[PDB]
Amino acid sequence: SEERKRIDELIESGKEEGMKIDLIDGKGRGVIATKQFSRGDFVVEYHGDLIEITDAKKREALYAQDPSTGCYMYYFQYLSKTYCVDATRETNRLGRLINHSKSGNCQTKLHDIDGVPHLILIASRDIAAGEELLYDYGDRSKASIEAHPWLK
Amino acid sequence: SRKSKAELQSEERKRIDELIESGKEEGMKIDLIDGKGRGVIATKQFSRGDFVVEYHGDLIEITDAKKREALYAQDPSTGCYMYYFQYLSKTYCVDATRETNRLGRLINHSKSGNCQTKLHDIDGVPHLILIASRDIAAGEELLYDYGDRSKASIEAHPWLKH
Ligand SMILES: *C1=C(N2CCN(C)CC2)C(=O)c2ccccc2C1=O
Numbered sequence: 001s002e003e004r005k006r007i008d009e010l011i012e013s014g015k016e017e018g019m020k021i022d023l024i025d026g027k028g029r030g031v032i033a034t035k036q037f038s039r040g041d042f043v044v045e046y047h048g049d050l051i052e053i054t055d056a057k058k059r060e061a062l063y064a065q066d067p068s069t070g071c072y073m074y075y076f077q078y079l080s081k082t083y084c085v086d087a088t089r090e091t092n093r094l095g096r097l098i099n100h101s102k103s104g105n106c107q108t109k110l111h112d113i114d115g116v117p118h119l120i121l122i123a124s125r126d127i128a129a130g131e132e133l134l135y136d137y138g139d140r141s142k143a144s145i146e147a148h149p150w151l152k
Numbered sequence: 153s154r155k156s157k158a159e160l161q162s163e164e165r166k167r168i169d170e171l172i173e174s175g176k177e178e179g180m181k182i183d184l185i186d187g188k189g190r191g192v193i194a195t196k197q198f199s200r201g202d203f204v205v206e207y208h209g210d211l212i213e214i215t216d217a218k219k220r221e222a223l224y225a226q227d228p229s230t231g232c233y234m235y236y237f238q239y240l241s242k243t244y245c246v247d248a249t250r251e252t253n254r255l256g257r258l259i260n261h262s263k264s265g266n267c268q269t270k271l272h273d274i275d276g277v278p279h280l281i282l283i284a285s286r287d288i289a290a291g292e293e294l295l296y297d298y299g300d301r302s303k304a305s306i307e308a309h310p311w312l313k314h
């Protein structure tokens with residue numbers, strides 16, 4: 001990833017330069033690059049509510065009663081404990097809308113600031129403008145399964 | 153009308169049987185919709201009570217459905233297309249997670265929609281169908297209330313009750 005100071009400043013400001021929401025055949029919503037990114041560049045935060053697993057379960061019980069909701073819980077482990085970034089609410093933050101690929105052009109990185117973990121996407125290779133932004137949801141999937149033993 | 157309630161039902165049942173057998177889904181298209189992604193749009197008129205489309209997929213029982221959910225959770229490209237429902241003494245599920253062509257799975261939720269789910273029996277096999285709850289004009293998004301579907305999923309998933 002690029003310089004830590006710069007990443008911290010982007011995370012704090014929430015500036016989401018260089019991408020747009022689009023509608024994509026066979027998928028629905030996705031995110032399209034509107035600028036070039038170099039390998040290692042910060043692309044965007046997977047931004048939502050950072051919560052612990054107890055609160056995530058309760059939230060999943062609410063979301064299950066609300067048919068408009070999509071699946072936006074991103075589970076992960078930080079310093080032994082399980083956390084979740086809950087991006088279920090419709091906002092203007094774009095990371096939550098980035099779709100899955102095994103050969104995507106972004107990768108998840110856990111980037112902590114003063115003891116608070118953030119899930120961010122970094123460019124895994126150079127990205128041309130016009131490409132759909134995509135990352136491997138494998139780790140996300142695994143963590144979901146780990147957090148719901150009834151699935152497993 | 154000279155047609156009794158029972159005559160209407162028999163007539164409508166024949167119409168629906170033939171559309172299930174054929175699988176024809178005329179009068180609609182897959183679309184991309186701002187703020188939603190995929191959905192289905194009416195491209196002809198439908199009158200209140202008309203068959204619109206089947207919610208087509210693999211009919212399975214609850215134990216099987218929960219086994220499939222564990223597999224779908226491993227493949228991140230899967231959407232949420234399990235439709236649970238009660239039929240007589242049992243819960244079933246129409247699994248449309250691996251349907252391609254058949255559009256019923258793609259119809260979106262609303263509380264103010266223009267379709268209604270009905271259970272249609274063909275020789276003891278339950279089929280989930282969508283019928284028009286009012287007249288629908290070409291250009292309109294097809295929409296039904298997922299309430300019953302949502303309540304049945306919760307009943308099948310005790311983990312999601314709390
Ligand atoms: C996606 C889910 N959702 C949220 C609720 N809405 C109605 C459908 C989409 C889940 O409910 C859920 C629960 C447990 C594990 C995984 C998921 C999803 O992937």
Ligand SMILES: *C1=C(N2CCN(C)CC2)C(=O)c2ccccc2C1=O
Pocket residue numbers: 071221224225226227228229230231232233305309
């Ligand atoms: C939607 C789900 N899916 C299938 C798996 N993919 C990866 C995400 C979307 C669920 O997994 C699920 C499980 C239990 C209850 C409800 C749901 C969904 O709504």
